């Protein structure tokens, strides 16, 4: 079984999903789903399409180079099946993926910090440049307090 990625989508293709395409140069183009497949025929560019992962690794979004991401490459030399490798890899894959998420969430906070600065500078323009609307709300509070009275 092979969880191989979409050619266009970079999402996992579980066994039983998606179409394969084979070029006459004989390399295989496995596809996530029909949306990615019909967009491939039409000669698009996933550097340009915003929803795919090839855009997001290129356009300065979600982190691309990491020491945790080099653990799952491919192996063309088979490792002869010792069990005590297998018992640690089932503990390794639960450990690499946690450090992946603690770095990816921390990479998201570098990209979204200081929004509250621009959130508050946006509010100084709305409040201060509308003096006439702020008179209307003052009588709205006084009419609110008087109805309870």
């Amino acid at each position: 079984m092979r969880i191989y990625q979409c050619h266009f989508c970079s999402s996992p293709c579980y066994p039983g999903h998606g179409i394969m395409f084979v070029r006459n140069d004989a390399k295989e183009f496995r596809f996530c789903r029909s949306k990615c497949h019909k967009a491939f025929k039409q000669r698009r560019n996933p550097r340009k399409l915003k929803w795919t992962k090839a855009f997001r690794k290129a356009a300065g979004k979600e982190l691309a180079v990491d020491s945790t991401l080099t653990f799952a490459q491919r192996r063309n030399v088979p490792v002869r099946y010792n069990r005590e490798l297998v018992a640690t890899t089932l503990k390794a894959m639960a450990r690499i993926e946690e450090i992946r998420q603690k770095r990816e969430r921390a990479f998201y906070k570098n990209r979204m910090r200081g929004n509250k600065e621009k959130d508050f500078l946006r509010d100084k323009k709305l409040v201060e440049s509308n003096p006439e609307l702020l008179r209307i709300r003052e009588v709205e509070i006084a009419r609110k307090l008087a109805k309870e009275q």
Binding site: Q5, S10, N45, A54, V65, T68, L69, A72
Partner: protein, 131 residues
């Protein structure tokens, strides 16, 4: 699915694609083969006057002069600037074979890049001298 997209993008009427065309420009031997094809009866310009960027045969040498000075052919020049998007770019996006990916990007930056640009410079040096 639709009407217009079926007419041009069936399996029968598929063009070459962007992957192989970057390989043809990347070396000096495959450029000289395609510029100098042996003449064939089953091909539109009788196996001459072939553009390498757009995988497309032209009827006459006049039809290369008017094809290069167009917004259609200035897509494919601007399309083939960078790394040609193999399968390896899509696998690196999921956290899978970075060192296979980053070494190829290292080679396109160093070796394959300026060999391609010194080939596309000579095509404009040749297709202006003959046309």
């Amino acid at each position: 699915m639709g009407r217009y997209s079926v007419k041009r993008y069936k399996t029968k009427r598929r063009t070459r694609d962007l992957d192989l065309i970057y390989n043809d420009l990347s070396t000096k031997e495959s450029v000289q083969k395609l510029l100098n094809q042996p003449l064939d009866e089953t091909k539109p310009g009788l196996g001459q006057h072939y553009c390498i960027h757009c995988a497309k045969y032209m009827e006459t040498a006049i039809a290369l002069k008017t094809h290069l000075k167009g917004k259609v052919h200035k897509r494919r020049v601007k399309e083939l600037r960078g790394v040609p998007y193999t399968q390896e770019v899509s696998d690196a996006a999921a956290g899978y074979n970075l060192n296979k990916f980053l070494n190829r990007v290292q080679e396109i930056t160093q070796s394959v890049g300026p060999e391609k640009e010194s080939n596309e410079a000579l095509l404009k040096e040749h297709l202006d001298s003959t046309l």
